[PDB]
Each structure stands twice: as structure tokens, then as C-alpha cells.
Amino acid sequence: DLTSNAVLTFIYFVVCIIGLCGNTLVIYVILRYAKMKTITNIYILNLAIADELFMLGLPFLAMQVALVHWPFGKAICRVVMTVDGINQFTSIFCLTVMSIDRYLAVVHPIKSAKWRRPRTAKMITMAVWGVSLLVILPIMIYAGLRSNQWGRSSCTINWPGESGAWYTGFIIYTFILGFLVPLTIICLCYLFIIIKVKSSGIRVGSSKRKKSEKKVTRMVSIVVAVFIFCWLPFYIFNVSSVSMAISPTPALKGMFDFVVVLTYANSCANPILYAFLSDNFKKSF
């Protein structure tokens, strides 16, 4: 089982360094080359900052999966679990408000001129960080340490009282407002964009909606794909673990650690996907 944790620490590190260099590159072009007056510019910038802090807490989780012992401490684990928690909900909420902003800009191009604004986008991001701190209340007030008989110690969220009630209650709490609601909003917003582009194409009669709709449909397809592949298996694994007791297996540990790197890889590829494949960003860079 030594080569299993070795290759796991390896994939945890390469996804971290590609996240540090990748996100710092996006921040460098946004602050220096690009301007901070564009609404979608500060959105990717806020997403890059949330991705940067998410990658900074990854070495703490990478060291936890390397060796079972956690020699860091208690207060240091409390703050890194909050950082990892506040960055996950922020990046999820940033994707939601970005899909809504794209939905308002395409479906309602007239009302969006007065709805969204640089001052309004700052209030939206401030509200995103506000609700993200509100959904991580149990993570901050129920964090602790767990000791083992072999001398090992693992830092995780502990729920007082009888078991089987707070565990399944929290796993459905983060599944609805973290996976269910954000995905359906993004899916409905992206679907309305396709209908709006298709409606605008058949009304103008320019006969150029073929290449335009195909590029947007491909962009929406790859976005939803990498979102599902790195969030759906990770969530169903948590629900299946808290609903029925599963025996400890090194294959299950490797599979659980694998879907986490995919989640970090999605948070790593999301800023570079909105930047590299973009037209205005590539022209500035």
C-alpha cells in the first residue's frame, strides 16, 4: 500500500503546481494586461483568487493522504478546513452567478444593460462571500480531532449526539445547495442561452448561426461534462458511505482520493478554460 499513497501524493502535487502557475498566470494577465472595468473580467479574477486559495490548502490535504498521522495540530486544521470549505462554496457560487450573468446577457440583452454593473457585480461577489460563510457554519463549529488505537490521529468534522442523524443531514445539506441547485441553475441558464441564440439566428436570417451555435453548444457541453465528472462521483461516494456502512478497503481509499484530485483539477481547469478559450482574454495575453 506504499506505492498507492506514493502515486497519490504525486498526483496531488502535480495538480497543485499546475494550479499555482495556472491561476497566477490568469491573475497576471487580468491585473496587468486586461482591465478591471469589464464585468466578466472581475468575475474570472474573483474565481482565480478563490482557486488560488483553494490550491494553497491542497498541500495540507495532500499531506493528510500521504501519511495517516496528522502532526499539524488542532487550530491549524480548523482554519484550513474553513479555507478549503470557503473556497469550494465560493467557486461553486462563482460558477452559478457567472452562468446567471451569461443568461441575463444573452436571453435579455436589453434588460441586462441596466441590471448588471461594475458596482452591482461587486455587490454580487460580496454576497457570494457572505452566503459562502453562512453555509460553512457547521464546518467551523464541529471540527475536531479523532484518535486511533495505533497512535494515529485524523482531523475531521465531529458531530455530537447520536450518530446517523447529523451525518445524513449534513450530506444532503451540501448536496442540494452545493451540487443539486447550482447544477440545475447552470443547466437552465445554459439551455436558455442556446434557445436565445437559436431564436436570434432564425430571426435575423443571416445564415451564420451554424458555426456560432455549434461553438457555444460545444463550450456548454465540455463545461457540464467536466463539472459532472469531477463532482457527481465524489458526491455519490459520500452519500453511499454515510447511508450504509462500508468496509475499509485500500481500493476505496484510492478511489476516494482520486475523485478529490478531479475536483481540484476542475477548480484548476475552470479559470484556464474561461481565459485561454476566450477571445478577449487571448487578445490581451
Binding site: N148, S163, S241
Partner: peptide, 14 residues
């Protein structure tokens, strides 16, 4: 207590 195998992101043995 409970001693869950995998709950959010950690591996807690029993």
C-alpha cells in the same frame, strides 16, 4: 461518534 469511513474529505479509521 459514528466513526465514519469517508464523510467529507478525510480518512478516519476506527
Amino acid at each position: 461518534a459514528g466513526c465514519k469511513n469517508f464523510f467529507w474529505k478525510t480518512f478516519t479509521s476506527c
